[PDB]
Amino acid sequence: ILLFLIDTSASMNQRSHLGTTYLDTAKGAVETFMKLRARDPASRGDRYMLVTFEEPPYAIKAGWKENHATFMNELKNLQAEGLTTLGQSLRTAFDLLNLNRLVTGIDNYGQGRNPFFLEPAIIITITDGSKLTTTSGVQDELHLPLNSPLPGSELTKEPFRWDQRLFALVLRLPGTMSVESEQLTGVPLDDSAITPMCEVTGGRSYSVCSPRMLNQCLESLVQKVQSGVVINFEKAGPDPSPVEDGQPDGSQPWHSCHKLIYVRVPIGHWPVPESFWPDQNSPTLPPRTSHPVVKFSCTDCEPMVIDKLPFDKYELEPSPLTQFILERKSPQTCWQVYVSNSAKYSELGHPFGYLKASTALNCVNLFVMPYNYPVLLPWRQSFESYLKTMPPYYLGPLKKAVRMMGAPNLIADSMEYGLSYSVISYLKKLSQQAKIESDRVIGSVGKKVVQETGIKVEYTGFQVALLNKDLKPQTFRNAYDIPRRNLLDHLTRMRSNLLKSTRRFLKGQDEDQVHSVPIAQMGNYQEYLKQVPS
Amino acid sequence: GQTNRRHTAAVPGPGGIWSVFHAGVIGRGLKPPKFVQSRNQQEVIYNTQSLLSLLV
């Protein structure tokens, strides 16, 4: 799923050095991105959406239940007229991407946080350089407005989601020559108000300066689409305890890269449950975070973990692997990882996995382990006392693995909270109704706005008409659509047309055809008694 | 240097029973002005001489 955000604002009317405006260059770049992505044999399941800088009823051009034909037709007729309302457009796009999330089961907020339930989405937000306006002045903060929150959105406290990356294109093409071609293989950043918003999600922001640089950035962007598993790392709290082959001193601490969870839907178990201590009676649930604040500690702690535990291959995208490569990729050794923010009743973090590398030393495998592996792996009334340290709802998925061996547990203590189940079906129904109402009025514009609003300065109610583009005057049916110049000739033409008594008469003077004239479409409505047997 | 009376007296395609032969006009055709700059050759360079003398 790819949602292209093209502003089509009035500031996108300035002409480049090639002769076309920035909007035409953006549309051409989108078309070349389409034809480049079509090369990879994986573009048979994705869906394209379009978002412009227009009113909430008119911002979306093609959303759910819209094929490629209507999407291309809407992107073709894009007009650059309006202000640069970036915040409202980003909010509308994020709400559109989060319409079918509370109904299928993604981010249920009650049963862990399953990383194998993915809904990838990439935003391009092709906008102008700077100087965004909000009908009052020029702002320099880019704060997303919060006026009408969706039902069930206060449990994340952030507009974007687990898998929602945000790339940006500014299209800073000069007007005279664009002769800046010193650095060949180098794509700098835009350094604008959208740069922090993009970096928070996990995607960079390109700075287009030349058509060659545009082609380079488009060819570099097609290689950044996969399953979205974005997790945040922190150096705390080990004081860079990497004393293995050298001495530490770094910027590879707050790594917020993605992870490629390739399927073999995705197959996996043992998710990151949450970051708080869930109580048995809690009417209000604390809001989750889109990026989990999980921290790693550099300790050997028996990296050899061999068992019949179901295996996972959530591949990690190499972005800050320099710190690992400095220590020879940690051969035959790993380092634990633990989620912060009160992972248990009374403690600060519980190691639930590690980041052991592969034998090929190519990337990090991201070995996800159970909540507390070094205890259950090595019954004398031990498991009954051990199952009290883990979160309650967490007994859900692990028991499935126990199904591979037997079934000692039951549904006696399989209860998260009596108040968490309530006020959940109503929120899901409200979200479904909102998604249906949004998908219903998605393409039907029905503007019907043509007036001059004649002010005084039949009274207080007059309004002069405006020039209608698609008027289609009926010359043979309506007599008012016949001007004075070609009146007598048109009169004789109408007379001859009425006195001819032909078959299948029409009221159009000369209606040649539409913009498209297909050969197969016209040849299908015919009959040819021939087969060419010879 | 640099309406309908005439259209009615010759209408009905000379048949009074069919439509016109053509199918309309595109714009106007046969631009009336078609004027060319032919004011004068002499006494034009002397105005330029006077202007250059003023500028000098």
Side-chain angles (χ1 to χ4, degrees), chain A residues 278-318 320 329-416 418:
Chain A
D279 315 308
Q280 186 69 212
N281 284 157
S282 315
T284 80
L285 192 72
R288 287 190 179 183
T289 59
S290 48
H291 298 280
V293 194
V294 64
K295 305 183 181 179
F296 56 93
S297 66
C298 274
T299 78
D300 272 29
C301 53
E302 47 96 24
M304 297 312 89
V305 193
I306 305 311
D307 207 328
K308 300 181 179 61
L309 165 61
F311 195 75
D312 297 324
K313 192 48 50 193
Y314 294 159
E315 184 178 0
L316 183 156
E317 296 287 339
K329 210 60 66 177
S330 278
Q332 310 319 308
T333 175
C334 81
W335 53 93
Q336 264 174 352
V337 74
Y338 56 94
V339 64
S340 315
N341 311 67
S342 279
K344 198 192 174 291
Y345 178 78
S346 43
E347 77 181 358
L348 275 298
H350 198 172
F352 70 102
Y354 48 87
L355 279 301
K356 182 179 179 300
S358 87
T359 318
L361 306 180
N362 53 5
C363 319
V364 177
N365 292 319
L366 170 64
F367 288 102
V368 53
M369 304 301 298
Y371 188 75
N372 191 15
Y373 59 101
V375 192
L376 58 89
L377 294 175
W379 300 91
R380 66 179 301 271
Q381 308 324 296
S382 48
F383 187 79
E384 288 82 12
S385 45
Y386 168 71
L387 57 92
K388 304 313 291 174
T389 79
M390 42 88 72
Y393 58 92
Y394 190 70
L395 66 87
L398 62 86
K399 188 177 56 184
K400 318 317 182 213
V402 194
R403 193 176 297 182
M404 193 264 299
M405 299 299 300
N409 284 257
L410 73 170
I411 316 308
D413 42 358
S414 198
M415 187 61 255
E416 173 193 4

Side-chain angles (χ1 to χ4, degrees), chain B residues 14-16 19-28:
Chain B
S19 87
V20 295
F21 183 79
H22 59 270
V25 301
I26 305 176
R28 299 300 178 268

Side-chain angles (χ1 to χ4, degrees), chain A residues 8 33 124 157 189 203 360 462 465 485 518 520 533:
Chain A
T8 73
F33 176 85
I124 322 293
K157 92 179 300 180
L189 297 180
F462 192 80
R485 296 312 304 172

